Each structure stands twice: as structure tokens, then as C-alpha cells.
Amino acid sequence: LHKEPATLIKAIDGNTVKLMYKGQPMVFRLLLVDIPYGPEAAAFTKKMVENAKKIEVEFDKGQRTDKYGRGLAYIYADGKMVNEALVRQGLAKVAYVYKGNNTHGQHLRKAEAQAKKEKLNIWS
């Protein structure tokens, strides 16, 4: 897997963001992030992407867009994965793997388990 450069265009909600990617505007859905705290998750992703000096998108090895045309990726803000930060903060759950895109699933489930043990936010 490899990180590619992108530019924030705008924050949308906890697991959706609009980016300039290879010179075209594209809506991206954060892989493996399930939002059941919806405003809270939205605000967290919004801050994280808008303060970044560097946004990267990392496709997984399965299908790269969903049926609505959204890119399916891990999104990184200054080197930190947004998908993982949300889960570790207890602001989303880890989704069922979609079509071969599971490369970071174990890593994210470890972050979720930690959030759970700490009883954070959704794990109240």
C-alpha cells in the first residue's frame, strides 16, 4: 500500500471528506470506520483534516470506489491515520471488511479495543 498526496477541499462528516486527488475533486469514505456522537465524530475529523499541513490517501488492495463513486481509503493527516484516530477516541466502531479492503483491520480493532477498555465516548 502506498500513500498518495491530496489537498483538503472540505470536511463533510466523521467518515467522509472531499479532497483534490490527482487534480480532480473526489469524495472519500474512510475505510473500516462505522459511525453509529455523529456531530462529535464530524467535528473531530473536520479539525484533524483542516489543521493538517499534509493530507495523504492510501487505497487498500480491494475495490477502490463504492457504488456512489466515493473513494475507499485510509486518509492520513500529517502522517497520522484519521480512520485510526477516530476509532481510538471512541468516536466510531470498526466496520465489517468491504471487498478485500482490510489491510489495517487488525490495527484498527486494537485501537477500538483500547477505546472500549477506556470507556470513551461511544463506549460509555
Provide the β-strand partners of residue 20. 7, 25
**Grid-cell match 499534509, residue found:** 54
CATH code of the domain containing 73:
2.40.50.90
- Listed residue (73, 80, 84, 77) closest to 111, CA to CA: 84
Resolution in A: 2.0
Q: Which amino acid is at 12?
A: I
C-alpha distances in Å from residue 18, one per residue of 10, 13, 24, 122: 5, 10, 10, 25
- The count of domains in the chain is 1
Residues whose CB falls within 8 Å of the CB of residue 32, separated by 6 or more in sequence, listed in order: 83, 94, 95, 97, 98, 101, 102, 104, 105, 108
CA angle 26, 31, 35 (to 5 degrees): 100
Say if CB 73 and CB 1 are below 8 A apart.
no
Side chain identity, residue 47: K
What residue type is assigned to position 64 of the chain?
Answer: R
Query: Could you tell me the residue range of the domain that residue 111 belongs to?
Result: 1-124
